[PDB]
Design an enzyme around this catalytic site. Structure first.
Site, PDB file in Angstrom:
ATOM      1  N   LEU A  19       0.795  -1.221   0.000  1.00 59.87           N
ATOM      2  CA  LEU A  19       0.000   0.000   0.000  1.00 59.87           C
ATOM      3  C   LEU A  19       0.832   1.277   0.000  1.00 59.87           C
ATOM      4  O   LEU A  19       0.327   2.320  -0.427  1.00 59.87           O
ATOM      5  CB  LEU A  19      -0.947   0.011   1.205  1.00 59.87           C
ATOM      6  N   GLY A  20       2.076   1.230   0.466  1.00 62.23           N
ATOM      7  CA  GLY A  20       2.940   2.393   0.404  1.00 62.23           C
ATOM      8  C   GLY A  20       3.392   2.907   1.755  1.00 62.23           C
ATOM      9  O   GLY A  20       3.314   2.192   2.757  1.00 62.23           O
ATOM     10  N   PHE A  22       3.850   6.607   8.797  1.00 59.99           N
ATOM     11  CA  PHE A  22       5.109   7.129   8.280  1.00 59.99           C
ATOM     12  C   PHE A  22       6.019   5.995   7.817  1.00 59.99           C
ATOM     13  O   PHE A  22       6.956   6.212   7.049  1.00 59.99           O
ATOM     14  CB  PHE A  22       5.812   7.978   9.341  1.00 59.99           C
ATOM     15  N   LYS A  44       1.193  -2.506   9.188  1.00 57.39           N
ATOM     16  CA  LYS A  44       2.236  -1.491   9.226  1.00 57.39           C
ATOM     17  C   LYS A  44       3.516  -2.099   9.781  1.00 57.39           C
ATOM     18  O   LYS A  44       3.486  -2.798  10.801  1.00 57.39           O
ATOM     19  CB  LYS A  44       1.813  -0.296  10.079  1.00 57.39           C
ATOM     20  N   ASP A 138      -0.289  15.783  12.924  1.00 54.68           N
ATOM     21  CA  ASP A 138      -0.097  15.554  11.494  1.00 54.68           C
ATOM     22  C   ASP A 138      -1.434  15.446  10.771  1.00 54.68           C
ATOM     23  O   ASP A 138      -1.628  14.579   9.912  1.00 54.68           O
ATOM     24  CB  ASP A 138       0.748  14.303  11.248  1.00 54.68           C
TER      25      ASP A 138
HETATM   26  N1  LIG Z   1      -5.146   1.062   7.348  1.00 57.59           N
HETATM   27  C1  LIG Z   1      -5.059   1.482   5.963  1.00 57.59           C
HETATM   28  N2  LIG Z   1      -5.893   1.130   4.975  1.00 57.59           N
HETATM   29  C2  LIG Z   1      -5.476   1.727   3.843  1.00 57.59           C
HETATM   30  N3  LIG Z   1      -6.108   1.606   2.537  1.00 57.59           N
HETATM   31  C3  LIG Z   1      -5.446   1.889   1.270  1.00 57.59           C
HETATM   32  C4  LIG Z   1      -4.292   2.655   1.198  1.00 57.59           C
HETATM   33  C5  LIG Z   1      -3.693   2.908  -0.024  1.00 57.59           C
HETATM   34  C6  LIG Z   1      -4.248   2.396  -1.183  1.00 57.59           C
HETATM   35  S1  LIG Z   1      -3.474   2.724  -2.795  1.00 57.59           S
HETATM   36  N4  LIG Z   1      -2.100   1.735  -3.030  1.00 57.59           N
HETATM   37  O1  LIG Z   1      -3.139   4.143  -2.937  1.00 57.59           O
HETATM   38  O2  LIG Z   1      -4.446   2.548  -3.878  1.00 57.59           O
HETATM   39  C7  LIG Z   1      -5.403   1.637  -1.121  1.00 57.59           C
HETATM   40  C8  LIG Z   1      -5.998   1.387   0.103  1.00 57.59           C
HETATM   41  N5  LIG Z   1      -4.406   2.432   4.146  1.00 57.59           N
HETATM   42  N6  LIG Z   1      -4.155   2.275   5.449  1.00 57.59           N
HETATM   43  C9  LIG Z   1      -3.050   2.896   6.154  1.00 57.59           C
HETATM   44  O3  LIG Z   1      -2.901   2.708   7.313  1.00 57.59           O
HETATM   45  C10 LIG Z   1      -2.084   3.799   5.388  1.00 57.59           C
HETATM   46  C11 LIG Z   1      -1.878   5.103   5.803  1.00 57.59           C
HETATM   47  F1  LIG Z   1      -2.538   5.577   6.899  1.00 57.59           F
HETATM   48  C12 LIG Z   1      -1.005   5.925   5.109  1.00 57.59           C
HETATM   49  C13 LIG Z   1      -0.336   5.440   3.998  1.00 57.59           C
HETATM   50  C14 LIG Z   1      -0.542   4.136   3.581  1.00 57.59           C
HETATM   51  C15 LIG Z   1      -1.415   3.314   4.274  1.00 57.59           C
HETATM   52  F2  LIG Z   1      -1.618   2.029   3.859  1.00 57.59           F
END
Ligand SMILES: Nc1nc(Nc2ccc(S(N)(=O)=O)cc2)nn1C(=O)c1c(F)cccc1F
Length: 290
Positions: A19-20, A22, A44, A138
């Site tokens: 997902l990418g 901090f 995470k 933040d």
């Molecule tokens: N708990 C959580 N769920 C998600 N959903 C998500 C995130 C990104 C995409 S994408 N690759 O851009 O299409 C799709 C679904 N994120 N998440 C996080 O804690 C989270 C965050 F807070 C910050 C950065 C990344 C994360 F992952």
């Protein structure tokens, strides 16, 4: 052991998607029953697993575990992988990612009503956080996640601090400067009111739809001057904020919403509205519409 070490065993935490950033977050499925699959979760992990980073990770896990609110990302557990010699945070997975990427990707289903709904939900999450005497530090659309069309939740508590018992502010001794309050830039003092300043910046983000060059960094650089680099930028920013320099009203943004933004952007700490004031005002604006 912050979390039950058997709740999420690493042998059943199957990778699904990265997902990418901090730290670093993956999408996983916890599959305890052979191949029955099961619950989809966000995992995470640290990027530079040092002692200080892992202590900060423990602090963030303890912050998230103590929160239970409809507009806060749900803690689910902790996975002690690598033979219980590593630490990973388990939370709910929100399908539509960050509110920034949601506003950029899904403009076809977003209008002013949805924006005010998201604003109110963020305000209520922040009220809940303030009940715990936590300072998020933040607040930004990148750190607010979208579950569906009608639900957003505050996430990314990596920089969250707990207020001291006899202090209404936290002084950080160790940076999204274009979301910071002036006292945060000049004294490193963080409070609920600085979170309200960052929330004003968040409302600005929402009503800009995060279009080209309308972001707070690009706007502040256009006002300061793109010719400048380094600490001088910060300097100018401080000066800019000290004498009523503000982000402009986004195009198509109502004057009442921009008034809310400017009330949040008060150099006087105690004159900024509370999150309860803001939630009530936004919900009354929504309810008074036809
Ligand atoms: N708990 C959580 N769920 C998600 N959903 C998500 C995130 C990104 C995409 S994408 N690759 O851009 O299409 C799709 C679904 N994120 N998440 C996080 O804690 C989270 C965050 F807070 C910050 C950065 C990344 C994360 F992952």
């Amino acid at each position: 052991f912050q979390g039950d070490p058997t709740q999420f065993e690493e042998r059943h935490l199957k990778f699904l998607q990265q997902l990418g950033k901090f730290g670093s977050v993956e999408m996983c499925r916890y599959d305890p029953l052979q191949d029955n699959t099961g619950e989809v979760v966000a995992v995470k992990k640290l990027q530079h697993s040092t002692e200080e980073h892992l202590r900060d990770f423990e602090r963030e896990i303890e912050i998230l575990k103590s929160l239970q609110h409809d507009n806060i990302v749900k803690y689910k557990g902790v996975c002690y992988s690598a033979g219980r010699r590593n630490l990973k945070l388990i939370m709910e997975y929100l399908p539509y990612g960050s509110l920034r990427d949601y506003l950029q990707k899904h403009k076809e289903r977003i209008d002013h009503i949805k924006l005010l709904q998201y604003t109110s939900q963020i305000c209520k999450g922040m009220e809940y956080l303030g009940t715990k005497r936590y300072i998020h530090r933040d607040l930004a659309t990148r750190n607010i996640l979208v579950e569906n069309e009608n639900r957003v939740k505050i996430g990314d508590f990596g920089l969250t601090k707990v207020l001291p018992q006899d202090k209404e502010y936290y002084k950080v001794k160790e940076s999204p400067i274009f979301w910071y309050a002036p006292e945060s830039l000049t004294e490193s003092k963080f409070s609920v009111a600085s979170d309200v300043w960052s929330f004003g910046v968040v409302l600005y983000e929402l009503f800009t739809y995060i279009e080209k060059s309308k972001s707070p960094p690009a706007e502040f650089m256009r006002m300061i001057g793109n010719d400048k680099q380094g600490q001088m930028i910060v300097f100018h920013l401080i000066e800019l904020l000290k004498n009523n320099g503000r982000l402009p009203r986004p195009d198509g943004c109502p004057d009442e919403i921009y008034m809310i933004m400017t009330e949040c952007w008060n150099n006087n700490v105690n004159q900024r509205p509370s999150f309860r004031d803001l939630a009530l005002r936004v919900d009354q604006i929504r309810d008074n519409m036809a």
